[PDB]
Enzyme design. Structure first.
Site, PDB file in Angstrom:
ATOM      1  N   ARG A  48      -8.844  -0.546   4.984  1.00 49.94           N
ATOM      2  CA  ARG A  48      -8.613  -0.344   3.556  1.00 49.94           C
ATOM      3  C   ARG A  48      -9.292  -1.375   2.675  1.00 49.94           C
ATOM      4  NH1 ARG A  48      -4.774   3.039   1.794  1.00 49.94           N
ATOM      5  NH2 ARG A  48      -4.165   4.637   3.334  1.00 49.94           N
ATOM      6  N   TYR A  92     -12.176  -4.656  -1.710  1.00 50.20           N
ATOM      7  CA  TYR A  92     -13.355  -4.263  -2.494  1.00 50.20           C
ATOM      8  C   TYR A  92     -14.375  -5.391  -2.657  1.00 50.20           C
ATOM      9  CZ  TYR A  92     -16.150  -2.242  -6.341  1.00 50.20           C
ATOM     10  OH  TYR A  92     -17.177  -1.797  -7.153  1.00 50.20           O
ATOM     11  N   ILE A 150       6.226  -4.012  10.072  1.00 51.34           N
ATOM     12  CA  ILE A 150       6.335  -3.551   8.694  1.00 51.34           C
ATOM     13  C   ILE A 150       5.853  -2.110   8.737  1.00 51.34           C
ATOM     14  CG2 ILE A 150       5.458  -3.715   6.334  1.00 51.34           C
ATOM     15  CD1 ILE A 150       5.390  -6.885   6.916  1.00 51.34           C
ATOM     16  N   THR A 191       0.830  -1.203   0.000  1.00 47.19           N
ATOM     17  CA  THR A 191       0.000   0.000   0.000  1.00 47.19           C
ATOM     18  C   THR A 191       0.865   1.254   0.000  1.00 47.19           C
ATOM     19  OG1 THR A 191      -1.294  -1.334   1.569  1.00 47.19           O
ATOM     20  CG2 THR A 191      -2.121   0.851   0.980  1.00 47.19           C
ATOM     21  N   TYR A 195      -1.779 -10.362   5.465  1.00 50.00           N
ATOM     22  CA  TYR A 195      -1.791  -8.940   5.796  1.00 50.00           C
ATOM     23  C   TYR A 195      -3.243  -8.499   5.939  1.00 50.00           C
ATOM     24  CZ  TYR A 195      -1.239  -3.903   4.766  1.00 50.00           C
ATOM     25  OH  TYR A 195      -1.281  -2.543   4.722  1.00 50.00           O
ATOM     26  N   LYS A 240       0.537  -9.678   9.269  1.00 47.77           N
ATOM     27  CA  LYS A 240       0.797  -8.295   9.519  1.00 47.77           C
ATOM     28  C   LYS A 240      -0.544  -7.698   9.871  1.00 47.77           C
ATOM     29  CE  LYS A 240       1.823  -3.826   7.163  1.00 47.77           C
ATOM     30  NZ  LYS A 240       2.016  -3.317   5.823  1.00 47.77           N
TER      31      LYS A 240
END
Ligand SMILES: NCCCC[C@@](N)(CC[C@](N)(CCCCN)C(=O)O)C(=O)O
Ligand SMILES: [Mg+2]
Ligand SMILES: [Mg+2]
Ligand SMILES: [Mg+2]
Ligand SMILES: [Mg+2]
Ligand SMILES: [Mg+2]
Ligand SMILES: [Mg+2]
Ligand SMILES: [Mg+2]
Ligand SMILES: [Mg+2]
Lengths: 296, 296
Positions: free
Chosen positions: B140, B109, B205, B45, B135, B164
């Protein structure tokens, strides 16, 4: 402004042996036409836009355009992307291949700011001369197009004519049409189609209409004709199926229902989508039996 | 399991005149290496994965791999997608071009179910023989990989070694490591790096480490040695910059900060990302003055 409004269907994309079943796709669109739908939306979320190749995405837009030619049913092509260069490419393809307008979802995953959303949609709207409908669905994208951003885009870009709202927020629907009554607010949330229409919304882009196009189109047309009692009656009757079609992420329930009704040949998704649980498979079938489902 | 842990950086992607600035990218990676970072994540990202072309995405992975040769530093390649076939393609590319492992974000999405997430990651993990770090970033993506799904994937797929987390949910972090203490929990949220590590997390991260790599590396290595007093002190000192780097959507603030420190040549984003407001530009610079920023 040129507009595309009324009762519209977010078309499912049927797969057979891992490929788009293009004859089925055309046949489903003809069924929508025969049941009073005003426009179809190829390759939205409901059409598994994320997992189609660019070629398949192009192909579905073309089939929609060709199947609707000569019928006055319009094609509002799914053309959004979270990369502005991709969304512009899709917009130009849709325009050049005969779409009547485009639906363009707010960028997902990368969470643009309101300034970025404005520049995104300005670039898209400046790339074509056909109507552009914004599409707000924060639960899927991770961002919200604010009322101010929507209104600025409507006022600044001649072909941006409204927004499809899928946000569970009737307060925002009042905000939009109280401050900019010239825009076309489109319901993107089947369960609350009637409340959005009764506040001055001018259409729906529906999941449920894949299965029950006659009922969703009737609801919409009653409302646009100011027969609110009969529009509400259909909205109330549809509540149970409208909710069960989201017992898992759309379009997993609607494709399951279409398969159960014999309207598509194979219950196939592209990963990461997949069949529903056995329990939800049973709940969908049970709720469906309470509704009269038109054939071909 | 083979693992990639320690202090890791989600690399920004610099642009110059609309193209990836490849020499700057390599120089930024060398700067991370020289400041104690244990691994780099190209094209997550923070690297604007959504708006890179495939060729640019591949190029960034290769530059990272080439730049880390001859060092201890590993390349955990950004390889996620919301289409399983795209994520498998990226995973296989990263494997064949020498990445040490892959980071794979939950599909954005299209909101897969937990079953779909399991099948998605199983397909990715079966496609390569290098470590795979899940992740989770629901703000998001619009979906959450549940603790049960993460744990099943860790137990069922040899190469999946942890996750993550960017979910602001320390309860879930406890749930994860209490029921599966062998997994590698990695902080994806700079402000709470220390609490995640002190509960047994084994790395970070980081966004902030683009700007302050020595501080994030020290924090992590103090924590891994159970020198918690020192690790907490750095985490506390960094809280202000950790928060201001999200005053607008990541990576808008961090790229702005890197530009403000002279570490990249041009403050360029790909739409729909764009420059911050002039007010946030000033806020970022003011917070930056409180920190000691390593050069090249
Ligand atoms: N409708 C056909 C194309 C679908 C492409 C994509 N799966 C991914 C779009 C992308 N912008 C591609 C980035 C590729 C390089 N990292 C994304 O994954 O964000 C999506 O938009 O959902
Ligand atoms: Mg009509
Ligand atoms: Mg206001
Ligand atoms: Mg859903
Ligand atoms: Mg039954
Ligand atoms: Mg090159
Ligand atoms: Mg090496
Ligand atoms: Mg539990
Ligand atoms: Mg030590």
């Amino acid at each position: 402004k040129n507009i595309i409004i009324g009762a519209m269907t977010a078309l499912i994309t049927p797969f057979k042996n891992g490929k788009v079943d293009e004859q089925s796709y055309a046949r489903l669109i003809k069924r929508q036409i025969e049941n009073g739908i005003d426009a179809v939306v190829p390759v939205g979320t409901t059409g598994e836009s994320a997992t189609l190749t660019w070629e398949e995405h192009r192909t579905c837009i073309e089939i929609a355009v060709e199947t609707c030619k000569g019928t006055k049913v319009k094609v509002l092509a799914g053309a959004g992307s979270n990369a502005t260069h991709e969304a512009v490419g899709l917009a130009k393809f849709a325009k050049e291949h005969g779409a009547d307008g485009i639906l363009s979802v707010a960028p997902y995953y990368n969470k643009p700011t309101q300034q970025g959303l404005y520049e995104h949609y300005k670039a898209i709207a400046q790339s074509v001369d056909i109507p552009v409908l914004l599409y707000n669905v924060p639960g899927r994208t991770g961002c919200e197009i604010s009322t101010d951003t929507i209104i600025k885009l409507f006022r600044d870009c001649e072909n941006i004519y409204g927004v499809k709202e899928a946000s569970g927020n009737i307060d925002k629907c009042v905000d939009l049409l109280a401050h900019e009554p010239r825009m076309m607010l489109i319901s993107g949330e089947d369960a609350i189609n009637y409340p959005i229409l009764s506040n001055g919304g001018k259409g729906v882009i529906s999941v449920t209409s894949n299965l029950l196009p006659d009922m969703i189109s009737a609801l919409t047309h009653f409302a646009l004709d100011e027969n609110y009692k009969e529009a509400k009656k259909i909205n109330d009757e549809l509540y149970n199926i409208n909710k069960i079609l989201f017992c898992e992420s759309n379009p997993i329930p609607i494709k399951t229902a279409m398969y159960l009704a014999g309207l598509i040949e194979s219950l196939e998704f592209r990963l990461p989508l997949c069949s529903p649980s056995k329990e939800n498979f049973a709940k969908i079938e049970e709720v469906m039996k309470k509704y009269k489902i038109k054939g071909f």
